[PDB]
UniProtKB/Swiss-Prot annotation, chain A:
This is Large ribosomal subunit protein uL16. Part of the 50S ribosomal subunit. Keywords: Ribonucleoprotein, Ribosomal protein, RNA-binding, rRNA-binding, tRNA-binding. PANTHER family: 50S/60S RIBOSOMAL PROTEIN L16 (PTHR12220), LARGE RIBOSOMAL SUBUNIT PROTEIN UL16M (PTHR12220:SF13). It comes from Porphyromonas gingivalis (strain ATCC 33277 / DSM 20709 / CIP 103683 / JCM 12257 / NCTC 11834 / 2561). SUPFAM superfamilies: Ribosomal protein L16p/L10e.
From Swiss-Prot, chain C:
This is Large ribosomal subunit protein uL18. It comes from Porphyromonas gingivalis (strain ATCC BAA-308 / W83). GO terms for cellular component: cytosolic large ribosomal subunit. Part of the 50S ribosomal subunit; part of the 5S rRNA/L5/L18/L25 subcomplex. Contacts the 5S and 23S rRNAs. It comes from the Bacteria. The gene is rplR. The keyword Nucleotide-binding does not apply.
Swiss-Prot record, chain D:
Keywords: Ribonucleoprotein, Ribosomal protein. PROSITE patterns: RIBOSOMAL_L31 (PS01143). This is Large ribosomal subunit protein bL31B. One of its GO terms (molecular function) is structural constituent of ribosome. It comes from Porphyromonas gingivalis (strain ATCC 33277 / DSM 20709 / CIP 103683 / JCM 12257 / NCTC 11834 / 2561). Part of the 50S ribosomal subunit.
From Swiss-Prot, chain H:
Part of the 30S ribosomal subunit. Forms a loose heterodimer with protein S19. Forms two bridges to the 50S subunit in the 70S ribosome. Keywords: Ribonucleoprotein, Ribosomal protein, RNA-binding, rRNA-binding, tRNA-binding. This is Small ribosomal subunit protein uS13. It comes from the Bacteria. GO terms for biological process: translation. The keyword Ribonucleoprotein applies. The keyword DNA repair does not apply. GO terms for molecular function: rRNA binding; structural constituent of ribosome; tRNA binding. Belongs to the universal ribosomal protein uS13 family. The gene is rpsM. Located at the top of the head of the 30S subunit, it contacts several helices of the 16S rRNA. In the 70S ribosome it contacts the 23S rRNA (bridge B1a) and protein L5 of the 50S subunit (bridge B1b), connecting the 2 subunits; these bridges are implicated in subunit movement. Contacts the tRNAs in the A and P-sites. One of its GO terms (cellular component) is small ribosomal subunit.
Amino acid sequence: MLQPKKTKFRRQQKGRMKGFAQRGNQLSFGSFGIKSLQSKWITGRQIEAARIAVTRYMQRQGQVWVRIFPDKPITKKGEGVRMGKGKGAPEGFVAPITPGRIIFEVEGVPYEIAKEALRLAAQKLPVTTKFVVRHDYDIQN
Amino acid sequence: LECTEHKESGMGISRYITTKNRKNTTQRLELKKYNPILRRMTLHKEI
Amino acid sequence: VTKEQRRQKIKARVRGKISGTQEKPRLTVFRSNKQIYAQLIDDIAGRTLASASSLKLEMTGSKKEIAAKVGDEIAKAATEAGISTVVFDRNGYLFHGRIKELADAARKGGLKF
Amino acid sequence: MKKGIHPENYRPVVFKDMSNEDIFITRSTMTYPLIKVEIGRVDKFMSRYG
Amino acid sequence: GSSKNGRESESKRLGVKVYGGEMAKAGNILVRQRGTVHHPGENVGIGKDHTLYALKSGVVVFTRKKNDRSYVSIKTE
Amino acid sequence: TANLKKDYQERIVPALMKQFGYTSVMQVPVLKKIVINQGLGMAKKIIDVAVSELTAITGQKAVPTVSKKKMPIGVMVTLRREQMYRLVRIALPRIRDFKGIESKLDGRGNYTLGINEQIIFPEIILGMNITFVTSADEEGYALLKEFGLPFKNA
Amino acid sequence: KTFQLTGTPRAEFGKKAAKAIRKEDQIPAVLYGGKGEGVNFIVSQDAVRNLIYSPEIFLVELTVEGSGSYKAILKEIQFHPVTDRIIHIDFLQVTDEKPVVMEVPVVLGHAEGVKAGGKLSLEMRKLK
Amino acid sequence: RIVGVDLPQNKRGFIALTYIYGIGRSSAITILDKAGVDRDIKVKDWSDDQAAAIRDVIGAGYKVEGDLRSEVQLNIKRLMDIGCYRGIRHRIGLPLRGQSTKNNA
RNA sequence: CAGGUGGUUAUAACGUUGGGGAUCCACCUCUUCCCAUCCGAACAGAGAAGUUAAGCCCAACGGUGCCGAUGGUACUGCGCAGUGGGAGAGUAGGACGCCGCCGA
RNA sequence: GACUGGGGUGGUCGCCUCCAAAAGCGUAACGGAGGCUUCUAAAGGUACCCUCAGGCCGAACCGGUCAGAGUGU
Ligand SMILES: [K+]
Ligand SMILES: [Mg+2]
Ligand SMILES: [Mg+2]
Ligand SMILES: [Mg+2]
Ligand SMILES: [Mg+2]
Ligand SMILES: [Mg+2]
Ligand code: NA
Ligand code: NA
Ligand code: NA
């Protein structure tokens, strides 16, 4: 489970996700990847499940990069607790993403293997996804 | 240990009210201050 | 820490308080290893009104008397230019020695300051 | 420079080596006063028996 | 349970009071500030709490010098 | 006088040792000042005794050194224009255990000679830790070879 | 190692003009470098095939209808964050002197070769 | 002072010479007799000539001080590195002159 | 041939390479007095023994800093992206200052 | 006694600073974080003179590259 080793502040205001991702929207470090098409909070459990899927596929070959990191703490109130009286109990960390942000990247496997593995990873994520490849890629060899 | 201090020896009389730390300055504080009655600078001492 | 920057800091400190106008011009002084230069400056215009130095002036062998002669000369030049009040600028030097003699001689002359 | 703070009796003294005939003169703070200063196995076998 | 927060001090109404180009009488307060966000210049004085005020009557001028340092001055007559 | 007379007479570094031969004696390396600093954390009479020891060794008063956290944790003395350039001359007739003084430089020329025993002093647990700041244009070793003192590995 | 391209002149600037250009399936492009002011023009998404391509096809010969003809190379490309479509192209005009640094594909220790058009100083490409 | 060693200034010669590493009572007596100095003279009472004679007798023979220390260290190092019985006994810290352990150090 | 003192927010700074010297500046020489620090290193004084080595000035250098378009994009006002405003970063490039007064 | 996502329990009640605060000022929550109920006879005034912290080299001292330090709280 990805989460910061230390943090300055325990609580964070629930911000707002606004437009498209202007950084991290281009395939760097790899040849194939998947971009989000929605705005959402991605949890560490979802990230780990998707990474496990994409690594169980492709066998032992290739390399996989995860490009987002959960560093936003969230809280939950709890059953029987009324509104008010401060923040609730901490319940982990999330990464907020907007459409265009690349979540997963792979390199070192053929086109079909990459496409299938990234499909498998995308099926465990809470956002609809687009599969992308680097534009200077050669389809053969 | 910080307290009110009164400076005196005017001429009515001339008084100045200041503060001091008595533990730091056990001895009596004496300074030259302007005297309104005599219109000159005279030595005032803590009472 | 070069002596140039050491004097530049003191020059900035002195100029923080002293500035010259057409009335009460700045009297700035440069020392050097020999001779001594005095200048009368109107700072709002960036224009020098009077000057004096010991480059063509030589009477004794000792810098204190040479500085006194320069002070007398600059007092004369200022009174001829129509200057009676000034403000002295140390120009980064300690007010003691040759500059002290120059200022004292300028006091013996005109330049009521 | 500061008069009095610096140690006094800074006379000129001579260092003389008693076993090297060397004389030096300095101003060590201690007509110069004189201070005297002072300044294998096979072979063994062949030697024993041969 | 309970919250350990809930405190806040009163606002001090800091900021620029007379902007560049306006006319200021003598003694008018120009800036309320903590420290020297703006430094005094010609015909401008600075108080104990770094309040900038006019020493004359004229037009307020804001200027920027080296290190983007901001100066407030008064142009008179 | 001191060794300054002989040094000015010879001045062989510009020609005999060569280098910096710009017809300028102002390029010849010279020894700026010699600084002796003992230093000790025992404080409090240790400093009041070490100041006397340094003063006796040097011929000039040694002010205590602050430790900045506010105590006199060291004693030091700086000598110039009269340290045999008689300090170097007095140090020349000395010995302690054996020979083999180190030849470590400082990147600009500084014989920072660390001596454990203070019994090698003809006048006098301690230390010496003497240093020689010199204006070597500061050659690391080429102009730092103007040392007349003992040195290991020749 | 020589692409051919033609450009419709562009004189309207702003978000409105760029949107109007892109609605009819074309790309705003600028060309600068060397002496002379820059040239603004419009190319077509079909016309650009040096972008979705394996090699570094230097020497794009551009004929701009309102201007002359130049030999340039790809300098900067802007993509849409979501659709990955091409939204703007900037070309650097290469001259005889003033060598231009670019990226040249690597085969296994090989390259594609840059000696003409561009002078020298090729950095790398896909140095994995 | 004598060989780089400061002697007890208030002791007789035949005792104060034993304070040098490499000279005992017998060597001190022999050195004084060969140099021609009476053995019952305090160190402070030695003439300059007598001190020179004693130093010159100490030289040319009687390996003392740092020379003897280096010689002994070299001998011990050679004995240890030859890997003999006495070498391993010295390396392990046990008696090597025939003494029996299990009862005394 | 160099010095002093100012305006202009480093396009002005830093740096590397090379060259100065009748006097101008500086390094440099010595502490009797003024004055100062454990130390004439700094500060202060005394007049000319030698140096252009260093400071300083000049010239070349686009090296580190600094500045910086056009086009596009982000964002945004109008209660509709129809009609207006429009970055930041980056890329072309620029830049080894520009104007005064005094003295020689 | 009051506030209070019913009341009670728990917490809080005056002042200071940051964020919430939407690029003037102002602006709420039992929203998120911390402090105060003093201190200094110099830690006040002025003239003069200085410049921290960090990394490296040598062995508190030397050397030259460099706003991090301090400003009682
Ligand atoms: K723009
Ligand atoms: Mg506030
Ligand atoms: Mg811009
Ligand atoms: Mg109630
Ligand atoms: Mg506001
Ligand atoms: Mg607002
Ligand atoms: Na509140
Ligand atoms: Na910039
Ligand atoms: Na930019």
